[PDB]
């Protein structure tokens, strides 16, 4: 069972303060030291700081100016707090006993902190199948001009999963994200099978379903 749980994630406007709290179940947080580590989308692992099993907290260079790690033995929790948030602070935040030189190492499942300057739902346009296709055709959806990440894309409410490619979103010069989800299907089905992409954008509570018809 999961014994290290991160809470308090969510969206935060720039300059605001994330307040994440690691929680242990089945043992004690006073008995071991714990680190906070973050991972930006598509980036490596970055150390923030850690708190000794005693009670002294150490921070890294970037996190020194802004971060703060405390704990509370009464609730079996250690808590990270940053401030002066910005775009590069959007990451998944883990607490973990790194255990680089001891036997016990335990990680959390992580939690997402999203820094946003706006909340814009996506526009979904079709990627119509090729008319020049008895072989395999390509079709898909263009998820354009949304913020912040992420959007999830499924096909026919999950029924169609094979051959689906949902690309990583790119940041456009407008400062909005854009991605495509594509699927390859047999050409003979283009008059028989209906194809609908389901784009969910939880930050803006928008779900867009789009039917992708030939021509």
């Amino acid at each position: 069972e999961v014994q290290l749980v991160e809470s308090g994630g969510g969206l935060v406007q720039p300059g605001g303060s994330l307040r994440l709290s690691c929680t242990a179940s089945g043992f004690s947080i006073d008995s071991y030291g714990f680190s906070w580590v973050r991972q930006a989308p598509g980036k490596g692992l970055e150390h923030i700081g850690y708190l000794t099993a005693g009670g002294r907290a150490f921070y890294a260079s970037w996190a020194k100016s802004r971060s703060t790690i405390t704990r509370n033995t009464n609730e079996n929790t250690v808590t990270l707090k940053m401030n002066s948030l910005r775009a590069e602070d959007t990451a998944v935040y883990y607490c973990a006993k790194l255990g680089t030189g001891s036997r016990f190492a335990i990680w959390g499942q992580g939690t997402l902190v999203t820094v946003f300057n706006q909340i814009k739902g996506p526009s979904v346009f079709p990627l119509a199948p090729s008319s020049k296709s008895g072989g395999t055709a390509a079709l898909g959806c263009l998820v354009k001009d949304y913020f912040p990440e992420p959007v999830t894309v499924s096909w026919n409410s999950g029924a169609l999963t094979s051959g689906v490619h949902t690309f990583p979103a790119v940041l456009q010069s407008s400062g909005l994200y854009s991605l495509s989800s594509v699927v390859t299907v047999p050409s003979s089905s283009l008059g028989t099978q209906t194809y609908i992409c389901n784009v969910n954008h939880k930050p803006s509570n928008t779900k867009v379903d789009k039917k992708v018809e030939p021509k």
């Binding site: 150390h47 255990g99 990627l127 263009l142 790119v170 854009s178 495509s180 390859t184």
Partner: protein, 218 residues
């Protein structure tokens, strides 16, 4: 405060190969025992494999072997396996007096070799619904190919474009070990309606494949 410089930033090796990932210390802490090796699979949390330079954690396959030299720590996978293709990070704890911190490596993406495969190239004109919004995205798809290195060029009425396109690539498919790539050309409605021929050129080595459409023809 210190730097765990990893190498190589990425590598490709088939099953059974002997992979060697290295990790240096920028400075010199002379002898550090608290170096670990972590593994992270796409969309998964990091998983520890080696702690204390060489101690193999219980449950970890013995093909993973940790090796030390004071400053340069080396992860060695003797016989590569299908579940061993992921990103590996070295981490080390360092501290003096009023300083203490962990330092991760840049990572090492371990990818699996396969037979070269040419992409199925598809080109998608902008939808009429988008044109009403004043912008036209043209999308080019390169589906299920290997290797990832390819040059995708856009021609509008045979004039090579530049500065108005963005690319995106998936990870290796866990089944066929292939990549898929998309190139999105962004034009204004006015520019899109001025020109007729839209082309996507995909270049891999000695082969170039161009897929085109004429604006307004089915």
């Amino acid at each position: 405060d210190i730097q765990m410089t990893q190498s190589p930033s990425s590598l490709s090796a088939s099953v059974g190969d002997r992979v060697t990932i290295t990790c240096r210390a920028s400075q010199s802490v002379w002898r550090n025992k608290n170096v670990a090796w972590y593994q992270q699979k796409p969309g998964k949390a990091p998983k520890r494999l080696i702690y204390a330079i060489a101690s193999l954690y219980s449950g970890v396959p013995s093909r993973f072997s940790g090796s030390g030299s004071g400053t340069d720590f080396t992860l060695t996978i003797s016989s590569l396996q299908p579940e061993d293709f992921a990103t590996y990070y070295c981490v080390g704890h360092y501290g003096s007096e009023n300083d203490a911190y962990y330092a991760f490596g840049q990572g090492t993406k371990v990818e699996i070799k396969r037979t070269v495969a040419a992409p199925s190239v598809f080109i998608f004109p902008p939808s009429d619904e988008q044109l009403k919004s004043g912008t036209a995205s043209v999308v080019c798809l390169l589906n299920n190919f290997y290797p990832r290195e390819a040059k995708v060029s856009w021609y509008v009425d045979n004039a090579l474009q530049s500065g108005n396109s963005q690319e995106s690539v998936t990870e290796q498919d866990s089944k066929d070990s292939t990549y898929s790539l998309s190139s999105t050309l962004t034009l204004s409605k006015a520019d899109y309606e001025k020109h007729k021929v839209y082309a996507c050129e995909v270049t891999q080595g000695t082969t170039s494949v161009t897929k085109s459409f004429n604006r307004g023809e089915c």
